[PDB]
UniProtKB/Swiss-Prot annotation:
<keyword id="KW-1259">Evasion of bacteria-mediated translation shutoff by virus</keyword>
<feature type="binding site">
    <location>
        <position position="241"/>
    </location>
    <ligand>
        <name>ATP</name>
    </ligand>
</feature>
<dbReference type="Pfam" id="PF20819">
    <property type="entry name" value="T4_Rnl1_C"/>
</dbReference>
<feature type="binding site">
    <location>
        <position position="76"/>
    </location>
    <ligand>
        <name>ATP</name>
    </ligand>
</feature>
<dbReference type="Pfam" id="PF09511">
    <property type="entry name" value="RNA_lig_T4_1"/>
</dbReference>
<protein>
    <recommendedName>
        <fullName>RNA ligase 1</fullName>
        <ecNumber>6.5.1.3</ecNumber>
    </recommendedName>
</protein>
<feature type="binding site">
    <location>
        <position position="38"/>
    </location>
    <ligand>
        <name>ATP</name>
    </ligand>
</feature>
<keyword id="KW-0460">Magnesium</keyword>
<dbReference type="GO" id="GO:0046872">
    <property type="term" value="F:metal ion binding"/>
</dbReference>
<keyword id="KW-0945">Host-virus interaction</keyword>
<feature type="binding site">
    <location>
        <position position="243"/>
    </location>
    <ligand>
        <name>ATP</name>
    </ligand>
</feature>
<keyword id="KW-0436">Ligase</keyword>
<comment type="similarity">
    <text>Belongs to the Tequatrovirus RNA ligase 1 family.</text>
</comment>
<dbReference type="GO" id="GO:0098004">
    <property type="term" value="P:virus tail fiber assembly"/>
</dbReference>
<dbReference type="InterPro" id="IPR049042">
    <property type="entry name" value="T4_Rnl1_C"/>
</dbReference>
<feature type="site" description="Essential for RNA ligase activity">
    <location>
        <position position="247"/>
    </location>
</feature>
<feature type="binding site">
    <location>
        <position position="55"/>
    </location>
    <ligand>
        <name>ATP</name>
    </ligand>
</feature>
Length: 367
C-alpha cells in the first residue's frame, strides 16, 4: 500500500543528502505536498527499496502523514548498457518504441478542484506554472477535463513540456505539451498505449509510436541525427532509452574522454550516463567513465557529510570548521562551512566549482 511506499522513500532521504531528498511546498488551495526526488546516485543506490520511484513522486501530506499519492511520474530508467539493469536485455521482448521528446517532464495532480502540473522537482517551477497556463487555456479545455477526471480516478498523466525558450538540444517550433504516458497513482501500473490512443481527445497529444521487428532499430537510432532517440517499452511495461551519438556528443561537454576537466564536467551535469552508454562498446572507455564517476560520488559523499555535519553543530565553529577541512585534506571546505552562518542548494553549487579547481588531485590513479 501507499504507507509502505512512503516509508521506503523516507528511508532513502536519511541515508545521504545528495543521494535522496525531499521538499515540502504549499499550494494555492493551501494544501501541503511532499516531493521525493534525487540529485546523484550510483547503481547500488538504485537497488535500495523503491529507490527507482524516488524521481518526483509526490504525496499530499497531513503533518508527517501521507494521505495520498498526489502525483506519480515514471520510475527512474536507464540507457541500454548503462549499468546491470539494462545489460543482457532480450531485445526480442521490446514491445514497441516511442519518440523521445527533448524538454521537461510535467505531471498532473489534483489540488482540490484544480488539475495542475508539477515539474520534476516542484509545483512552483517556471515550467510548472507555464504548463499550468497552457492547460487552462481554451484550446486545451477538452484535455483539461479529461485529465481532471483521470486525476479523480487517481491517475497521473505525464507530459514532456517543449518550447523554443526551453531548448535543450532539439529545436521545437511551438511551445506545447506532449502526452507520454498515464500511471495509476497507487500501483504505478501504466495505462496501455493502445487505450490512450482510443481516446480521440488524447490522441492529438500522444507521443509517436513505432513498431519494431529487428534490433537493427538501435543501430539506426544510435547513428541518427536531429533526434534525441527513443524510449523502448518492454513487454513487461519497463522502459530503456537509446540516445543518438549526435545528441550525446552535443549534450556532453566537448572532448569529454580527452580532457579530464571535461569528463568531470560531464559528471557534475549528470550527463555521464548518456556518455557511458555511448562508449559501451569500448570496455576501456566504458570502465574509465565509471572510475571518474565513483571518484566524484565518493568525494561528494565525504564532502557533503563533513560540510553539513559540522555546520549542524561563535568563533568556536570557525576554529572547529578548520579541524574538519584540514583534518580531511580539503581546506576548500572551510568557506563552505561558513555558509550555515550566512545562508543555505546554493551550497551544492559551491562544492562543485571547488572540485573542478582541485580536480587534478582526484583524477583516478592510472588515468
Ligand atoms: N517518449 C518518452 N517516454 C518517456 N520519457 C520520455 C519520453 N520523451 C522524453 N522523455 C523524458 O525522458 C526522461 C528520462 O530520460 P532522460 O535521459 O531525458 O532523463 P534525465 O532528464 O537526464 O533524468 P534521469 O537521468 O534522472 O532519468 C523523462 O524525465 C521524460 O521526461
Ligand atoms: Mg530529456
Ligand atoms: Mg542523464
Amino acid at each position: 500500500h501507499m504507507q509502505e511506499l512512503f516509508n521506503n522513500l523516507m528511508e532513502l532521504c536519511k541515508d545521504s543528502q545528495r543521494k535522496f531528498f525531499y521538499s515540502d511546498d504549499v499550494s494555492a488551495s493551501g494544501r501541503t505536498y511532499r516531493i521525493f526526488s534525487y540529485n546523484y546516485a550510483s547503481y547500488s543506490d538504485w537497488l535500495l527499496p523503491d529507490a527507482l520511484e524516488c524521481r518526483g513522486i509526490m504525496f499530499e501530506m497531513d503533518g508527517e502523514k501521507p494521505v495520498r499519492i498526489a502525483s506519480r511520474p515514471m520510475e527512474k530508467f536507464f540507457n541500454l548498457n548503462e549499468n546491470p539493469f539494462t545489460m543482457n536485455i532480450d531485445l526480442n521482448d521490446v514491445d514497441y518504441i516511442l519518440t523521445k521528446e527533448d524538454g521537461s517532464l510535467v505531471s498532473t495532480y489534483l489540488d482540490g478542484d484544480e488539475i495542475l502540473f508539477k515539474s520534476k522537482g516542484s509545483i512552483k517551477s517556471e515550467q510548472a506554472l507555464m504548463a499550468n497556463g497552457i492547460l487552462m487555456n481554451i484550446n486545451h479545455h477538452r484535455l483539461r477535463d479529461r485529465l481532471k477526471e483521470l486525476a479523480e480516478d487517481g491517475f497521473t498523466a505525464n507530459f514532456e513540456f517543449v518550447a523554443p525558450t526551453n531548448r535543450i538540444v532539439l529545436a521545437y517550433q511551438e511551445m506545447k505539451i506532449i502526452l507520454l504516458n498515464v500511471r495509476e497513482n497507487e500501483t504505478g501500473e501504466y495505462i496501455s498505449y493502445d487505450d490512450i490512443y482510443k481516446d480521440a481527445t488524447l490522441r492529438p497529444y500522444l507521443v509517436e509510436r513505432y513498431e519494431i521487428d529487428s534490433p537493427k532499430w538501435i543501430e539506426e537510432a544510435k547513428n541518427a541525427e536531429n533526434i534525441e532517440g527513443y524510449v523502448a517499452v518492454m513487454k513487461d511495461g519497463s522502459h530503456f532509452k537509446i540516445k543518438s551519438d549526435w545528441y550525446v556528443s552535443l549534450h556532453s561537454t566537448k572532448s569529454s574522454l580527452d580532457n579530464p576537466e571535461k569528463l568531470f564536467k560531464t559528471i557534475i551535469d549528470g550527463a555521464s550516463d548518456d556518455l557511458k552508454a555511448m562508449y559501451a562498446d569500448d570496455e576501456y572507455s566504458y570502465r574509465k567513465i565509471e572510475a571518474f564517476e565513483t571518484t566524484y560520488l565518493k568525494y561528494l559523499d565525504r564532502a557533503l557529510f563533513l560540510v553539513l555535519d559540522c555546520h549542524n553543530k561563535r568563533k568556536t565553529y570557525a576554529m572547529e570548521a578548520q579541524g574538519v577541512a584540514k583534518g580531511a585534506g580539503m581546506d576548500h571546505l572551510f568557506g563552505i562551512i561558513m555558509s550555515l552562518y550566512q545562508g543555505y542548494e546554493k551550497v551544492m553549487c559551491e562544492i562543485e566549482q571547488n572540485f573542478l579547481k582541485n580536480y587534478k588531485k582526484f583524477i583516478p590513479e592510472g588515468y
